[PDB]
Amino acid sequence: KPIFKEVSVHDPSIIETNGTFYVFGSHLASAKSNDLMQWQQLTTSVSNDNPLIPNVYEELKETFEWAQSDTLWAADVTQLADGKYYMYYNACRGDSPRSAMGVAVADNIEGPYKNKGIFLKSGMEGTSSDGTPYDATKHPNVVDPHTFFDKDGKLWMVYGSYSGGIFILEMNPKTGFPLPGQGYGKKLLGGNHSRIEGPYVLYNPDTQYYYLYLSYGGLDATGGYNIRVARSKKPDGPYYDAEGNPMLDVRGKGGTFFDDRSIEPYGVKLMGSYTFETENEKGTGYVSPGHNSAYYDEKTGRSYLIFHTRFPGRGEEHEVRVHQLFMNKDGWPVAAPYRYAGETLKEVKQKDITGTYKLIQHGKDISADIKQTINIQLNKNHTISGEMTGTWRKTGKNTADITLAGKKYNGVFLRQWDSVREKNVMTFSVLNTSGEAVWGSKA
Numbered sequence: 001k002p003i004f005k006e007v008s009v010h011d012p013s014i015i016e017t018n019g020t021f022y023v024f025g026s027h028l029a030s031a032k033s034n035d036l037m038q039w040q041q042l043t044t045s046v047s048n049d050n051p052l053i054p055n056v057y058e059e060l061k062e063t064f065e066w067a068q069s070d071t072l073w074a075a076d077v078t079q080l081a082d083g084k085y086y087m088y089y090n091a092c093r094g095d096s097p098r099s100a101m102g103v104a105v106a107d108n109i110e111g112p113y114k115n116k117g118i119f120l121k122s123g124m125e126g127t128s129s130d131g132t133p134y135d136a137t138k139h140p141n142v143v144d145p146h147t148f149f150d151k152d153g154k155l156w157m158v159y160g161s162y163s164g165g166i167f168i169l170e171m172n173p174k175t176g177f178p179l180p181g182q183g184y185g186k187k188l189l190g191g192n193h194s195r196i197e198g199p200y201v202l203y204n205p206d207t208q209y210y211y212l213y214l215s216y217g218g219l220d221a222t223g224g225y226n227i228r229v230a231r232s233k234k235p236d237g238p239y240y241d242a243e244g245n246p247m248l249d250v251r252g253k254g255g256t257f258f259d260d261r262s263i264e265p266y267g268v269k270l271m272g273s274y275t276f277e278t279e280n281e282k283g284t285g286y287v288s289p290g291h292n293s294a295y296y297d298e299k300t301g302r303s304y305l306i307f308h309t310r311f312p313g314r315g316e317e318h319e320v321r322v323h324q325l326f327m328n329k330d331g332w333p334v335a336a337p338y339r340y341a342g343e344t345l346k347e348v349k350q351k352d353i354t355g356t357y358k359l360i361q362h363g364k365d366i367s368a369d370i371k372q373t374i375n376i377q378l379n380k381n382h383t384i385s386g387e388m389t390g391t392w393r394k395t396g397k398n399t400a401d402i403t404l405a406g407k408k409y410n411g412v413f414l415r416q417w418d419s420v421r422e423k424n425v426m427t428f429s430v431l432n433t434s435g436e437a438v439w440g441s442k443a
């Protein structure tokens, strides 16, 4: 039966190299795994003992001094054409966007990483990186980088957290620094201290779109953290959600902070807090899943969502999780309801589909409510009954075409492993046009 070995890496950024997967997160923490199931913890905090950057407090002295911090926030490590590993590091004071972002380079994924210097700052009292006075209602906090190649081999970096929103910069593929003259770069969304951070871009060759993943809400147990996605034909936008809303329009109301209500309507919502547990039956359950990265396996065409999450009843404890992603008929990804255990999309038979399901509806809100299950039943006559009504059918090998309460959803049927109950389960995972995700798990 499947084996898991857990690690804690907040804000994990996935990278595959040398036949092995690594995640690099905040606090100079990191872990590795060969199979995305058994992880080995490598580092956990910023100290002069951390082997990724020896004597880190001297090596990145200028960043800690600017940011007035003893830690680092959410790193990204990306391999460039010279074969070397470039870590995009950043620190932030924490109570304000007083931050610096820089890059360090290593010959080997596990270090040592050598500082090349700071290249962006936020939170200055005067002139900012774009030649205008720094203003956090429109300018970024210089944290949460994702440095990536587009389908043509051009290098970009997307970044941002709260403050003025999410931005993208053209990067130098020889040095790892931004090309000159761009300021903070091009704005993709955001404004007025919206609760939106952790951008990540993944291309899908089959659908021919770039997917911009984001985290909405606050990270903590009462924060309503949830993972959302939008897409564009180009890496630098414009990005839209499944209803065709332009992501550029998303921001808080002028003169406010953390206006969740104005931003909720925008983006496809893939996953938020939920539990399959009931009084009578154990189940899986997350609180505030978010700050994701994503991986595309060119050998198989399979995609994976990698993220941290908290849990019902475990306070602020967090661990890394991985869920497989599937593109639906309209070119939007749905997440497997259970963590990755080596499952793949296979042929599904009608006999396997019929029966009773526990249903999670992730909705479109930012909410600290842990979503709970209701029970439905997929009938042999193609109706759905029980605590909701609708219809189901299958397209081809495993495509789920489901109607619930007069809304139409599309995704997949998928047999997988429930690691809490330690049983196989038939599931479905689907998405409607409003960007609402629904998961079914069969009883």
Ligand SMILES: [Ca+2]
Residues within 6 Å of the ligand: 011, 012, 013, 074, 075, 076, 144, 145, 146, 198, 199, 200, 291, 292, 293
């Ligand atoms: Ca990240």
Ligand code: NA
Residues within 6 Å of the ligand: 045, 046, 047, 070
């Ligand atoms: Na420390």
Ligand code: NA
Residues within 6 Å of the ligand: 013, 014, 015, 076, 077, 078, 079, 147
């Ligand atoms: Na990377």
